[PDB]
Design a binder for this molecule. Sequence first.
Ligand SMILES: C[N+](C)(C)[C@@H](Cc1cnc[nH]1)C(=O)O
Ligand SMILES: [Cl-]
Ligand SMILES: [Cl-]
Ligand SMILES: [Mg+2]
Ligand SMILES: [Mg+2]
Length: 430
Amino acid sequence: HKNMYDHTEITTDSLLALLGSEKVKIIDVRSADAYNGWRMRGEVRGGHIKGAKSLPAKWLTDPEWLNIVRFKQIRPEDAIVLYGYTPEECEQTATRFKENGYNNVSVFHRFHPDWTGNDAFPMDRLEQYNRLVPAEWVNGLISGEEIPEYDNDTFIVCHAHYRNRDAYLSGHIPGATDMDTLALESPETWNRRTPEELKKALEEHGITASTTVVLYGKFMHPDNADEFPGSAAGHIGAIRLAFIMMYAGVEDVRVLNGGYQSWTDAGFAISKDDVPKTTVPEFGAPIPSRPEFAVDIDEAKEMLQSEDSDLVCVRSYPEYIGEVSGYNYIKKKGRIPGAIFAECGSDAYHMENYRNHDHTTREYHEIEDIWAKSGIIPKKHLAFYCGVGWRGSEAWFNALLMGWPRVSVYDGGWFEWSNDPENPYETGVP
Ligand SMILES: C[N+](C)(C)[C@@H](Cc1cnc[nH]1)C(=O)O
Ligand SMILES: [Cl-]
Ligand SMILES: [Cl-]
Ligand SMILES: [Mg+2]
Ligand SMILES: [Mg+2]
């Protein structure tokens, strides 16, 4: 019946008439960063067609491509409409759908410049997308080239890791310097360090409050059998450090979307130099400048008693039901009573529910809709937490990117909560 290699074109008028159809799935095959709003071809309006889902053509080489599509609830009985910067970029995706039994597949040729160039055509974007940067933006930054969403004259690219300098020395973005997560958080409490420590640490790494800091980490397949599996979850650590730096007072913090893998996926050169630090004498702002980003245990207890506040438990399901603690250095098992569960992923060192297979952030509409089903909504003051505040920082960053007005991280997490034998806790399947 179908032709695997000749695809029907859908017109702008036809697509306009189908924008509200529940039987139609509009699929943006560009990069997730363009989908979020980055104007990667110089378009005046960035983002995606309103209601479109993100399925980057880059993922076509992934052997799990069909499961990704099914996990996104894109079904063979749906009418599939693909679009990219050009219709030619949609051809391989269209063929891939037809090869897997999707018989209703069309290609929209006029997204750019026709759709982007007229304000009558509805578009959407991740409100604070410029904090989540693509690899091309970082490459222009370190090359001293004109890049959008950047009006500063001072920057530093920071490769985060947890007591694992090999994560940096085995390959890093050229010119980048490494920051151990221990520089900004204490091994005694696994909370952010005191203001005086953060001031010294940031200065010794060459960071002022007015320095644009670009953070990223390297995913190295964490294994629960290792003594420090967090040494392999570099990009969670990067977002954890982004939280602490923004809390401290760094005005412009960016995160490389997808971490190190996005840098090498783009084909850019890597460096193995051990770049020395260029310290700065004065941070230049009071620390912390944004204390409302952090929540501690007394306020967290209040938020459990408030109508417009909630704690969001970003742990794994075995941790939530008290089957495991999730950590080799925590013996207590259980959960904070009254918190809203938002499953992070498989265990304490993986964020499958918040990431794509290439570690870029999951399509934010999916995060937003799943959160809303559990009452995790922006009208509340939300304190994301987990074991020790790493996974909660990554969840918190996703909400911050959506422009949510009062989102925090409860730093202490299950570690601090369970360390007080007076605190109530639950266990078992709810
Ligand atoms: C605070 N450290 C770095 C010790 C944590 C960080 C962490 C990563 N995923 C959940 N927590 C650890 O590695 O167990
Ligand atoms: Cl990671
Ligand atoms: Cl918990
Ligand atoms: Mg949208
Ligand atoms: Mg903590």
